Write a protein that binds this ligand. Structure first.
Ligand SMILES: [Cu+2]
Ligand SMILES: [Cu+2]
Ligand code: NA
Ligand code: NA
Ligand code: NA
Ligand code: NA
Lengths: 620, 620
């Protein structure tokens, strides 16, 4: 009955039938995106209407459409034709990936390049990558993918070990034309294999690891009701899933005595960009928007008990649409479990004689996605003490190139002749805040150093200052780790028992933001990634920091255009957008498969409660 | 047989007998520090000599002594009288703590101050705190403690909830004189209790937490031999314990095929300082050097199975000396166990069809200490992939004051009338490096942004630069999170298979360093805390960043005097000293007992191995 429930197979089948009957889903049409729309603000009238947003692509060259459908009423609400040279192309379709390799295999220029290198076309895999927007005027309004080649010596070989450098092709996937083949010269194809399950490479497996058994003899402490509503240790939330964003958390609230207190209305990773820093023309166009261009949710893994998720695991299996509108279940795509998290609080008091120890735990909600060579885990954590944390885990196989004779300033060497270009992995968390309700404000908090002198005669004092961000034009902020800079989201109309506004503090990891030149194409298309924090006024249609149609969009969409409205954000319904990422200079230890590296952020209560919220935790 | 074995009770009893027979341990003497000396460089002659360093205090006013004893030979090696006005006082003795409250209870000025506040002297607890060096000329060469008062309403009451502000006393603990009593005015004593085990405050305990059972049915994967030598998943190390530093890690090495490769010769937390930022004269002198002044190892907790350490736990029970030279065992003072640590590496490959997942784990070595109101956990972690990490966990009860009517820029309000002064908790990790041997160097690595232009026509390139630190005078470095600054410790004479020097990268958390004015007493005495990284040339007697005798030392000892030697550190036996800490603006949620907060650092391999070192991990 909850309006935040997961999309059902029946809902998706109804959408398919509504689109078909309306004449919108002929044999030339493909669904490039389908997802449920969140309830509009002020849905306290019970008039629930399950609506779906659909992007429809046309493989014959006709204009695509954006369509909104009401499943409850069985009607098309709106249908708009899209001019993609203006507003951007639709996300990449899974079926277009195979098109690239097939088209190149019959192109005379591609075959000549492979022949010069003595490569059998049947062994050459082509990575189909998003195109971006660069200098090629003929690409405007066309759906382009770019292809880079890798050799697979046999069907189970890791092709990533054998990049074919000096060669790139561009393909129009609608007209099925190879537009350009660029060959800048022959590089040796690195010969060592990268097969991390081959005993020749692994050696004998260790026999020294004894099992660790994690069990819950009475079952888990959380409950799941209505399919996706979770209650755990005073937390309450709904777990959503969207094919673009992946796991989305709704209605995060904390039961403080008799009051259910809201904290975050909607939390998601709303974009992620992987820009490459190699100036070679073979790769200088390479930038993945995994969320906006590829849709990370549709490549979610099925997670295996004991391997991917260990302990007493509760799974959700979200349903998405395939390209024809058929429901597709991602079996065991979301893992939920609680974990012990060490000591929560401890004190041994000499004067009172009381020894006190309590243990901490966290609730984990996670999924994993695979896009080409990279695999990313998305982890949300809720802690007993009111802390909320996000962690991204990056693994998989690094993207490779040749390593040039005489070295490189922009590529690491991993093996003889094998390089890995420098790159970043940058995320945008969209936090639709609701600290004790929707009237919120953001303050920037810096440490303040004080000079020795009158009122500070021993030169020991230090302080802090808070600056309220009052309008969107002043709410684009940078990190400053040296001054301990954090941001506080507070509710000025809800006070704790000391008459201070209740709040939560955002702690960033203070990693570098986008490194590209500010005049570059990627800086324009991923403007969100150039700054650590943005605050906007909530609006229904401002969903993604990069805009709705990221693929081959010329730039400036999303956050830079939103904040030009210069809206009041001082005690209003606001959204925090936090940029955070990893800068990856690959090391030898990342090859042939990369150990996990992590980045994230957390929010901790700041006078939200009237005292510690974990005094009622028992001594187990 | 190992020279790095823990001190035994028999060794400490022999030291006592040697000191007594030599006439050095009469009834007026107290042992303020006793610890084993590490083997000198080049102990490959098997001529092992177990030597102990002892600081001997004299309660009658005679000069203290530093003494070195050989247990194996039964001899006093050296004994030097100390001029404490020059070189610093000895660490605080546990028995001097009680002296402060007892002396004040009979002092006319103290009793008048308590009478004005209608406080029963029998209910007033006095926190005995280190004195530092300030403006009082009569304190030079005397052992001073300063006392702050708290009311205990009944024997099990938390006195920290009831600070007596406006009042401080200074006590000479050798002559047993109260030198000064300062009363700046009457503040109301905050009346609310802070008793976190009282049902009136906790409410009914939760019944919702179901058990998490962590067991190892075949026992742990590590082995312990010779009392303190650990082998675990290719790691090899010795776990030491010193009464000043606590847990010390020796001889950290990694078994890479047939080679045992050294990484770190000695790792320890060699100082920790807690400076307070309240300019009130009642507290503006307040700075704890928990390691150097109090000795954190002697206040180590006995850790309880199931509460402090959960899982299959192996304990060590280190032995220390009491003030009379009797051995004292800290039962279950060190916990060791392995923990599951999520996904280690994962990839699902479209082209090869191979799905691959491996799990990570870490080895944990930890102890907890309690000094007055604060409790600190020290955690060392070893990971399968070669990562070494340290984490400090801070909990306990925050130090309190009155909250002034009309507010404060330097104190948080926690409860009606109850304040908590701003402060920091700053640690110094001393890392005696041995990356593949003792010839090491440090490079500072910054990200390099590049301008769009020739050779970078699309403005996407970025790079990095490394600067070798060649002499001690250039090896005092600051963090720069915006440029992704890290430090690499490498061995220029040991190369990986790509002919690059092997190395490890230090990743800092980039938290603020010491905030006090640089002209302050604390900035002079804790100079190490003003900079993030120091590199020195190894020397036997350069053990602590603050010098040997920190208590009431006037300043400048330790690292600033060491680096004035300006020694060669480019491919030499070097020591890295890393400053890291927490800046604590107390929140309401920290009261009445503080949930754990953490800070730390980690080191990751950087071309140390020829490929990923965890290819031989099995699929469990
Ligand atoms: Cu990467
Ligand atoms: Cu603190
Ligand atoms: Na456009
Ligand atoms: Na909001
Ligand atoms: Na002196
Ligand atoms: Na060294």
């Amino acid at each position: 009955a909850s309006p935040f429930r997961l999309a059902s197979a029946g809902e998706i089948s109804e959408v398919q039938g509504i689109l078909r009957t309306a004449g919108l889903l002929g044999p030339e049409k493909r669904i490039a995106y389908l997802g449920v729309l969140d309830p509009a603000r002020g849905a306290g009238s019970e008039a629930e209407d399950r609506r779906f947003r659909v992007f429809i692509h046309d493989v014959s060259g006709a204009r695509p459409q954006e369509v909104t459908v009401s499943v409850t009423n069985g009607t098309v609400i709106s249908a708009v034709e899209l001019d993609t040279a203006a507003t951007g192309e639709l996300p990449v379709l899974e079926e277009e990936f195979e098109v690239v390799e097939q088209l190149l295999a019959t192109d005379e220029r591609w075959l000549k390049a492979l022949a010069a290198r003595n490569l059998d076309v049947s062994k050459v895999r082509v990575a189909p990558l998003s195109a971006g927007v660069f200098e090629y005027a003929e690409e405007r309004g066309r759906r382009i993918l770019r292809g880079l080649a890798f050799v697979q010596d046999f069907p189970e070989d890791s092709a990533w070990a054998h990049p074919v450098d000096g060669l790139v092709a561009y393909v129009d996937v609608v007209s099925k034309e190879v537009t350009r083949v660029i060959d800048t010269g022959v590089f040796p194809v690195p010969a060592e294999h990268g097969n991390y399950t081959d005993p020749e490479l692994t050696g004998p497996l260790r026999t020294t690891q004894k099992p660790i058994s994690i069990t819950q003899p009475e079952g888990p402490s959380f409950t799941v009701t209505g399919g996706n509503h979770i209650e755990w240790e005073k937390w309450s939330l709904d777990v959503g899933f969207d094919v673009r964003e992946g796991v989305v958390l709704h209605n995060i609230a904390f039961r403080d005595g008799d009051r259910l207190r809201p904290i975050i209305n909607r939390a998601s990773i709303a974009e992620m960009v992987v820009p490459y820093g190699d100036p070679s023309p073979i790769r200088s166009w390479q930038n993945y928007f995994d969320t906006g261009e590829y849709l990370v949710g549709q490549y979610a893994n099925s997670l295996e008990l004991g391997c991917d998720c260990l302990g007493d695991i509760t799974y959700l299996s979200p349903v998405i649409s395939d390209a024809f509108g058929n429901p597709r279940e991602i079996r065991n795509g979301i893992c939920m479990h609680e974990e012990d998290w060490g000591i929560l609080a401890k004190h041994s008091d000499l004067w009172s004689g009381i020894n006190y120890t309590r243990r901490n735990r966290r609730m984990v909600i996670s999924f994993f996605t695979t896009i080409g060579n990279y695999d990313y885990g998305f982890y949300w954590y809720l802690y007993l003490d009111g802390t909320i944390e996000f962690e991204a885990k990056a693994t998989g196989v690094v993207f490779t190139s040749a390593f040039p004779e005489g070295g490189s300033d922009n590529i690491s060497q991993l093996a003889p002749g094998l390089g890995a270009p420098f790159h970043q992995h940058i995320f945008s968390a969209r936090l639709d805040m609701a600290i004790d309700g929707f009237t919120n404000r953001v303050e920037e908090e810096d440490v303040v150093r004080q000079t020795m002198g009158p009122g500070n005669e021993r030169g020991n004092a230090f302080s802090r200052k808070r600056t309220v961000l009052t309008r969107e034009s002043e709410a684009v902020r940078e990190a400053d780790a040296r001054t301990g800079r954090t941001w506080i989201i507070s509710n000025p109309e809800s006070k704790n028992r000391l008459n201070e506004p209740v709040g939560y503090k955002l702690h960033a990891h203070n990693q570098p933001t986008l490194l590209a030149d500010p005049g570059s194409s990627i800086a324009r298309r991923a403007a969100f990634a150039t700054k650590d924090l943005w605050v906007t006024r909530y609006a229904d249609d401002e969903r993604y920091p990069t805009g709705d149609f990221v693929n081959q969009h010329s730039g400036g969409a999303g956050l830079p255009s939103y904040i030009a409205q210069d809206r009041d954000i001082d005690g209003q319904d606001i959204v925090v957008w936090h940029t955070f990422g990893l800068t990856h200079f690959p090391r030898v230890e990342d090859w042939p498969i990369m150990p996990v590296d992590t980045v994230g952020f957390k929010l901790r209560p700041e006078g939200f409660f009237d005292r510690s919220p974990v005094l009622d935790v028992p001594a187990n």
